[PDB]
Design goal:
397 residues, mainly beta, 4-stranded antiparallel β-sheet, 1 helix, 2% helix, hydrolase, Rhamnosidase, Bacteroides, Beta-propeller, monomeric
Length: 397
């Protein structure tokens, strides 16, 4: 299970290696693209042909505040091959750049998307849409509460338009933390936890919504159309998980070829001190939740000794990527041949620790080729810059 070295990246924080890099790594056609901060804080872009181990790197004109692990880089390609980059935010004015040509590691100047409510950004994320268009999501904090703002890029028009200004509504009462995925049909999947207070221990529940029409109209998994915006009272609950359950925020989710959502997270049971990894999914008929791990070591959120997970699905076959102090903080794989039967195997994918690392993966490679590639780097949360690798993952023997 092979480990392709890219270049040295910043390792003194987990900025290159958070679960919410959407994306760190992206394939189009026969090429794969990557982004990270180098040891000196510069935004580096890379590309390769997928059949090669040789990366072409470009140190761009931009830097980021690498001492803050929130200040991540997200990238994506549109249907014409232009790279879109957004980076370096913890409640700051939008940093957004496009490549100057398709398939080329040359960034233009920073530019607005719509110019509206772009003053206080955190957590930029890109998703591909049908027709080569893009979705952008970010957390806007300008109101005093983190609000989900969603834009659509038309690749033909070379233009961004707002889609949703108020999709999840905390009613000046509660907070919300979300993750998304665009499936192989072009449907946007959305899931989130609520948080009653400002403190992480009041994280509760997993809610869900989807949109088939690029974010305009929204549906529940049970088929009912949403009245917007989505509040505590009308949200579809994928799973109930109470406050003070060590429920974590900002994880990941995926979907299978049938458009069914799967959500990967962790929390602990009422009668346990031990948080466990979970999978929450809708099979076209109903919601399910299951425990993936069999941990025995407590921790509390009130660095975290386990990583927030990533998942990919192939017709009920599940690859569930994690990192855990119980397994020496290696890159680890929890694999299920069939999600519905719940027989999991556990396999370490690295023989060395990656400490603060959380997984991000090449979402488009998995969709287009059913190959699972991870962004892998040893980070901490003074440590010399460590190699960034791409690791291909296959089912275990």
């Amino acid at each position: 299970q092979q480990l392709v070295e890219v270049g040295n990246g910043y390792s003194q924080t987990s900025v290159n290696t958070t679960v919410f890099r959407n994306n760190s790594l992206v394939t189009q056609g026969d090429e794969q693209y990557i982004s990270y901060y180098d040891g000196d804080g510069y935004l580096v872009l890379g590309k390769r042909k997928l059949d090669s181990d040789q990366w072409t790197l470009k140190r761009t004109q931009y830097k980021g505040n690498v001492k803050d692990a929130h200040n991540i880089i997200s990238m994506m390609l549109d249907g014409e091959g232009y790279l879109h980059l957004s980076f370096d935010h913890h409640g700051h004015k939008l940093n957004y750049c496009r490549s100057t040509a398709p398939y080329t590691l040359e960034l233009g100047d920073k530019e607005p998307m719509t110019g509206v409510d772009e003053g206080n950004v955190t957590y930029p994320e890109f998703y591909p849409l049908n027709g080569g268009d893009l979705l952008f999501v970010y957390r806007s904090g300008s109101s005093g509460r983190g609000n989900l703002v969603m834009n659509h890029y038309s690749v033909k028009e070379k233009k961004w338009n707002r889609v949703q200004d108020v999709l999840i509504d905390g009613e000046d009462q509660r907070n919300a933390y979300w993750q998304l995925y665009v499936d192989e049909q072009g449907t946007i999947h959305l899931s989130w936890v609520w948080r009653e207070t400002w403190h992480v221990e009041t994280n509760h529940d997993l809610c869900y919504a989807r949109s088939y029409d690029n974010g305009v109209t929204w549906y529940k998994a049970n088929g009912k159309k949403y009245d917007l915006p989505i509040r505590y009272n009308n949200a579809e609950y994928a799973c109930r998980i109470p406050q003070n359950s060590e429920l974590i925020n900002q994880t990941s989710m995926s979907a299978d070829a049938s458009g069914n959502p799967y959500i990967a997270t962790y929390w602990r049971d009422p009668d346990s001190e031990v948080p466990q990894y979970r999978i929450v999914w809708h099979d076209g008929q109903m919601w399910h939740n299951r425990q993936v791990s069999n941990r025995h070591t407590p921790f509390s959120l009130k660095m975290i000794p386990i990583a927030r997970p990533r998942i990919v699905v192939d017709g009920g076959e599940i690859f569930y990527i994690f990192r855990d102090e119980e397994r020496g903080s290696r890159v680890s794989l929890a694999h299920a041949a069939a999600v519905g039967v719940g027989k999991w195997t556990f396999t370490d994918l690295t023989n060395f620790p990656v400490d603060a690392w959380e997984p991000s993966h090449d979402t488009e490679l998995w969709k287009q080729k059913r190959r699972l590639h991870l962004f892998v780097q040893h980070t901490k949360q003074e440590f010399a810059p460590q190699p960034v690798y791409v690791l291909e993952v296959v089912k275990p023997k």
